[PDB]
Write a protein that binds this DNA or RNA. Sequence first.
RNA 1: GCACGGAGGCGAAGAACCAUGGAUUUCCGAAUGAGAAUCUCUAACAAUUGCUUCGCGCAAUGAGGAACCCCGAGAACUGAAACAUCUCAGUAUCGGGAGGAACAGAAAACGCAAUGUGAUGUCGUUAGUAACCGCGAGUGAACGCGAUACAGCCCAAACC
RNA 2: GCUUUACUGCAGGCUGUCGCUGAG
Lengths: 56, 65, 194, 81, 119, 46
Amino acid sequence: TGAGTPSQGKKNTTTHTKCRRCGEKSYHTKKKVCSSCGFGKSAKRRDYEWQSKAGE
Amino acid sequence: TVLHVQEIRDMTPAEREAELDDLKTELLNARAVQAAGGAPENPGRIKELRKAIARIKTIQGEEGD
Amino acid sequence: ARSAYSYIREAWKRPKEGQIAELMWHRMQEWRNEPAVVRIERPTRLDRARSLGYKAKQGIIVVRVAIRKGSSRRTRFNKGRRSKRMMVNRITRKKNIQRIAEERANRKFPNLRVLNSYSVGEDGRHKWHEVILIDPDHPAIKSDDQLSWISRTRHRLRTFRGLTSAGRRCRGLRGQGKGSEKVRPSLRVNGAKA
Amino acid sequence: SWDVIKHPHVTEKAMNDMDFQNKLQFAVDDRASKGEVADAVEEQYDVTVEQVNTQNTMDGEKKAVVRLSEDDDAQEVASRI
Amino acid sequence: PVYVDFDVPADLEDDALEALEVARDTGAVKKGTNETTKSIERGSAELVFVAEDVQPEEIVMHIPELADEKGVPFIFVEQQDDLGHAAGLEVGSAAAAVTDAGAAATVLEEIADKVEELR
Amino acid sequence: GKKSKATKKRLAKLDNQNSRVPAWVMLKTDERNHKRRHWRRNDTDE
RNA sequence: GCACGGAGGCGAAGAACCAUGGAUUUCCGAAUGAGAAUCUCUAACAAUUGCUUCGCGCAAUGAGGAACCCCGAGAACUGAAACAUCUCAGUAUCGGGAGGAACAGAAAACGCAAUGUGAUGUCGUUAGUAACCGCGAGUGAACGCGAUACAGCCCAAACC
RNA sequence: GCUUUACUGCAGGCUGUCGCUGAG
Ligand SMILES: [Cl-]
Ligand SMILES: [Cl-]
Ligand SMILES: [K+]
Ligand SMILES: [Mg+2]
Ligand SMILES: [Mg+2]
Ligand SMILES: [Mg+2]
Ligand SMILES: [Mg+2]
Ligand SMILES: [Mg+2]
Ligand SMILES: [Mg+2]
Ligand SMILES: [Mg+2]
Ligand SMILES: [Mg+2]
Ligand SMILES: [Mg+2]
Ligand SMILES: [Mg+2]
Ligand code: NA
Ligand code: NA
Ligand code: NA
Ligand code: NA
Ligand code: NA
Ligand code: NA
Ligand code: NA
Ligand code: NA
Ligand code: NA
Ligand code: NA
Ligand code: NA
Ligand code: NA
């Protein structure tokens, strides 16, 4: 079976959903953790410095 | 408009509540007429009815009911 | 005449001698069955605490903290590293155990602030220190002309910024002259070179 | 504080229920239970509510189908508004 | 415990505390370990009391040997608050000193004897 | 699929946001809905 | 309101509009009764603490913020025309935390060695000087001086 | 990337010593 097109057919699972905390569709409903704001893992909001050029 | 602030304050706590429940019903019947696509409207009032209600509520808080 | 305190001090100069020696052998046994952070009604070293700022007053807390001995508990590298940085065993942290203690204690008492801390011995693997903490919200401390300074907002979380006792000493700020070129007025401002 | 009744839901189907089954349909706040819907209705129109059916609509609001006792007449209650 | 080498019978203790109370009213007494310590050093101490329920034990450790090399007699009390109350304090006390008894210099002197004998 | 009362509310808003700028606004502005979302060509969140 | 339509309305009971103060202020959210993709289930400072009338009674913490600041963790590409110490660099990045600024600070100092200076930052200079270093490549201060601004105190103990 | 008696190091294992550690 091709890992391409023919393997695209089984993708009827729901994972990342609208996050109750930040409103982005990144709340992983299996993990109960948001990939965007960290809701469900961190009380503090997710944020890293590599999200921007070092000097900015 | 047809209902000023002085007049709301010249009411007794029991008169505002009576006036309130009065406006709420005018409003509620206004909305029913609108919900039925009713044209006998006068948009300026359904708007006023909301402001009058706010004022009354505002005063109720000021006077302590 | 010598203060009664002066005796408590004298005894602790050589914690492995005479009476205090047998006291430690006794205590530690109970200590090793105690938690990481245990509040205690009275300082084991009265002279010490009082000397540091302690007072048998409302809003003043003391707690004994157990920290593991030895170098840094470090994980080996999982990617490319030059020999110099393939280190594991001999690497030691730049924060002394006493300072770790101060922090652990402080976290256990979120509303309190660290005043000072002192050692109370160690066995083969532990190291115990007692930390004096203060409730910057309790009047009597707000009203104490000798401690009310710690109630100031500018002092929120003193330990975590190293504004402590051992904090400043650990930051190499002891000397005012030669040697402190990279220490004062702050390690970070000196580009982290001490 | 929110009010239970929002406004009368008037549509061809609502009409049929009112004319043929003595039922009044309303747009009610979605936090309102059938019982709350029942009381509010009786108090607002002075009638006897027999049964209430609810449905959360694809309009973001809750719809309530209220049946009045044979004693009352929906057609008449609705005609005064 | 570590600074306690002999046990004081319940009764002896009572005669001791009894003497202390009359001491505070008839003579002079020092309340608190510090004040107690200075007495032994300044020699003005005739009889010194030391609790057995003191924690930490460092606060008192020195009393015994300090008193032995100063000739001043000392006795052990079991309860810390009994010593306090007896000395006339609303709080407890780790140690006390009878600085010149009063209407008890007799009974007292004999308690010192009873203890010396208690080895 | 089984949707919840909250979900249903959202899908609902989206459907509404999928109406066209009323004619009157055209006149009142002397003269486009950039948020037009087809159910087949577009994909909603969640 | 943007927004110049239609209908209607408000304003001399001084509206619009602006300033300050006040009312209201759904749900999720540190999110704190418990659970949950913004809803639900049967009184709530959840959790950790301080005081304690030992009762959540009185209080604290939590999270945010453009960067700045302070305390910890800590690369590699690269340079050395290879490369290992060295360099990139205590940089990037990561953990913890404060403020409106932080940090530092009233000598167990300096050491133009003196019959001298006199808390601390910072700026200019001292200086690519001294010092480091396969003594390669590279790395790199301080005292002092001139300025800015200046400010000096509180415990522990002895004796009570 | 991989290999090894290539160069340099780093974990890990074994072993001596110190501290925990005391009585005859
Ligand atoms: Cl702190
Ligand atoms: Cl000079
Ligand atoms: K390198
Ligand atoms: Mg693949
Ligand atoms: Mg249903
Ligand atoms: Mg439609
Ligand atoms: Mg909650
Ligand atoms: Mg390389
Ligand atoms: Mg190279
Ligand atoms: Mg600075
Ligand atoms: Mg070369
Ligand atoms: Mg360098
Ligand atoms: Mg110098
Ligand atoms: Na704290
Ligand atoms: Na250094
Ligand atoms: Na509606
Ligand atoms: Na779609
Ligand atoms: Na508001
Ligand atoms: Na709280
Ligand atoms: Na309580
Ligand atoms: Na090269
Ligand atoms: Na190469
Ligand atoms: Na080198
Ligand atoms: Na000169
Ligand atoms: Na390869």
